């Protein structure tokens, strides 16, 4: 079986889910999590349901969870393939952080886009240049990609 | 005109500039003093980044002002 840590995090995630976040292990791989983040209220993504996958690499928790959007989203820190620029996923990882905190941080990222530390440079420039329009695009994309999906 | 540029080490050089000198001119004169290609240089004065085409005086840089040289990254 698994490290007891992974069993404990999983029991606690299933028994006490993060609000706005569905997260459950794969029937056949307890290290793989099917995730759905609801677009935050008062964000361009409101009404959206965003699919995400999370994977615990064999070195976890000494290595960060791998996470990616599987739903297309217009956001300065998410690229075309759904990869996520978030400091705790890379150089600010600590093994005292949990899946719960990775999930909360991504949710919070949706509510608080960071164009100044871009992954998606086009989206970021548009977020700086013309925020209003960048927000309306994010809205349209929510409707296009993140509704009945 | 005389200005100090300061790296993260705390090494400070000194340059002969003019207030009508553009950022490119400096970056070029940091290069011939330190050997750093201009496309690797990011100069900062009082919190704000200093873009290439522009001039010294635009950012209100005056005699014995201190600029901060850090590396110009690919983007993160």
């Amino acid at each position: 079986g698994l490290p007891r840590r992974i069993i404990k995090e999983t029991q606690r995630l299933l028994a006490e889910p993060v609000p706005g976040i569905k997260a459950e292990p794969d029937e056949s791989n307890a290290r793989y999590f099917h995730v759905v983040i609801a677009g935050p209220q008062d964000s361009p993504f409101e009404g959206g349901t965003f699919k995400l996958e999370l994977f615990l690499p064999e070195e976890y928790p000494m290595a960060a969870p791998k996470v990616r959007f599987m739903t297309k989203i217009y956001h300065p820190n998410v690229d075309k393939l759904g990869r996520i620029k978030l400091d705790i996923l890379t150089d600010q990882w600590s093994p005292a952080l949990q899946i719960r905190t990775v999930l909360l941080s991504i949710q919070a990222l949706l509510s608080a886009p960071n164009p100044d530390d871009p992954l998606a440079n086009d989206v970021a420039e548009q977020w700086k240049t013309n925020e209003a329009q960048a927000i309306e695009t994010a809205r349209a994309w929510t409707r296009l990609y993140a509704m009945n999906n | 005109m005389q200005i100090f540029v300061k790296t993260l080490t705390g090494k400070t050089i000194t340059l002969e500039v003019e207030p009508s000198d553009t950022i490119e001119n400096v970056k070029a004169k940091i290069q011939d003093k330190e050997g750093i290609p201009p496309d690797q240089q990011r100069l900062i004065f009082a919190g704000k980044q200093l873009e290439d085409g522009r001039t010294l005086s635009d950012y209100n840089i005056q005699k014995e002002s201190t600029l901060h040289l850090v590396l110009r990254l690919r983007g993160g």
Binding site: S28, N29, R31, Y32, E53, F55, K66, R68, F69, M70, K72, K80, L81, G82, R83 | -
Partner: protein, 137 residues
């Protein structure tokens, strides 16, 4: 047991870095395909063979079971080689040991290198080839 999508993103990074002398290369066919299904491959025909210096373009498809199941490979560039269909370019899995006996530790890189290795075999090495540049339809 291997999560497909994360496996493919590692193959994309390695793809963009390039490996060795650059005799094999691969990347996404569409850089917005979040399924990471459709890939391109290049192989440079190896020396001391009729393939030598020719640039072969290939399509590689990593289906939903990848890498538990092997990918499908097709040559776009016309080639005479054991196990390549002459009207479609499709590669017969049975004829390529890596694909015939696929392991979930294999990759697009491994497939491409193996095809290049097979170009040097006694059966293929002196096969007459069609003119350079030509493709199937």
């Amino acid at each position: 047991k291997v999560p497909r999508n994360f496996r493919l993103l590692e193959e994309l990074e390695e793809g963009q870095k390039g490996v060795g002398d650059g005799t094999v290369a691969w990347g996404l066919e569409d850089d917005e395909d979040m399924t990471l299904t459709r890939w391109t491959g290049m192989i440079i025909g190896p020396p001391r063979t009729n393939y030598e210096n020719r640039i072969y373009s290939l399509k590689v498809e990593c289906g939903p079971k990848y890498p538990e199941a092997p990918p499908s490979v097709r040559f776009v560039t016309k080639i005479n080689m054991n196990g390549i269909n002459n009207s479609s370019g499709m590669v017969d899995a049975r004829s390529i040991p890596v694909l015939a006996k696929w392991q979930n530790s294999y990759s697009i890189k491994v497939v491409l290198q193996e095809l290049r290795r097979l170009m040097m075999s006694k059966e293929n090495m002196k096969l007459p080839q069609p003119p350079e540049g030509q493709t199937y339809n």
